[PDB]
């Protein structure tokens, strides 16, 4: 119903993996969160192993101004068709996601940073982040990373095998 629609069918939330996969995994994350950076390889692994998983992203910058810059920049990269590449590059970076580091990585992935910085001001960017905060509060998430796997809430770091187990259980229950 409505809960499901807000979580899984929001057009302003990036979709990775298989857009018609039968299990949706939602991740709430911050580019400066050590466990988010650790979760990147687990989530990539899941997506590589299971071609029937849809992956929905909630940018939830909570670790300060650098994190906010990174989340805005990433959402702005959608306008240049480079969200996914930019997300992986940020989440895999060495050192802090702050204005200078984010902009460096943006160049590396081939973004026009003058356009990126214009697009960072867009009200849809603000709307996404505000909704991530609201959804996090609704679901009882106290920080990042937190996951939803279909009907299940998984509010913490998990390995790929644990994500896969959650996905498999969701399919069994469907």
15 vs 8: CA distance, rounded Å: 9
Q: How far apart are the first and last CA of the chain?
A: 15
21 vs 54: CA distance, rounded Å: 5
Question: Could you give the domains of the chain?
Answer: 1-174 (3.40.30.10)
CA distances from 65 to 23, 43, 97, 99, 138 (A): 33, 25, 9, 9, 24
Sheet of strand 53-59, all strands in order from the earlier edge strand to the far edge: 15-17, 53-59, 23-29, 146-149, 152-154
Q: Which of 139, 168, 163 is nearest to 28 (CA)?
A: 139
Pairing of strands 146-149, 152-154: antiparallel
Whether the upstream peptide bond of residue 145 has omega within 30° of 0, thus cis, is yes
* DSSP designation for 78: G
Structural resolution in Å: 1.8
> If you compute the radius of gyration of the chain from its CA atoms, what whole number of angstroms results?
15
Which helix (H) or strand (E) is 27 found in, with range?
A: strand 23-29
Instruction: Give me the helices (H) in the chain, please.
Output: 2-8, 34-49, 65-76, 83-91, 99-108, 113-119, 123-139, 160-173
Q: Which of 134, 104, 81 is nearest to 31 (CA)?
A: 104
Partners of 59 in the beta sheet? 29
Q: Which of 58, 81, 80, 82 is nearest to 71 (CA)?
A: 58
Task: Please state, as a whole number, how many other Cβ atoms lie within 10 Å of the Cβ of residue 168.
Answer: 13
82 vs 10: CA distance, rounded Å: 19
């Amino acid at each position: 119903n409505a809960n499901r629609d807000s979580l899984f069918n929001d057009p302003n939330a990036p979709v990775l993996g298989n857009p018609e996969g039968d299990v949706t995994v939602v991740e709430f994350f911050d580019y400066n969160c050590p466990y988010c950076r650790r979760a990147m390889a687990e989530v990539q692994g899941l997506v590589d192993a299971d071609p029937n998983v849809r992956l929905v992203y909630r940018e939830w910058p909570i670790l300060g101004e650098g994190s906010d810059f990174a989340a805005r920049a990433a959402l702005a990269a959608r306008q240049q068709g480079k969200y996914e590449a930019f997300h992986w590059a940020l989440m895999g970076m060495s050192g802090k996601a702050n204005e200078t580091g984010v902009l460096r990585i943006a160049r590396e992935v081939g973004l026009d940073t003058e356009q990126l910085q214009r697009d960072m001001e867009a009200p849809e960017v603000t709307a996404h982040i505000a909704q991530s905060m609201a959804l996090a509060q609704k679901l009882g998430f106290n920080g990042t990373p937190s996951f939803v796997v279909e009907d299940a809430l998984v509010p913490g770091f998990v390995e790929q095998s644990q994500l896969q187990d959650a996905v498999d259980r969701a399919r069994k229950a469907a």
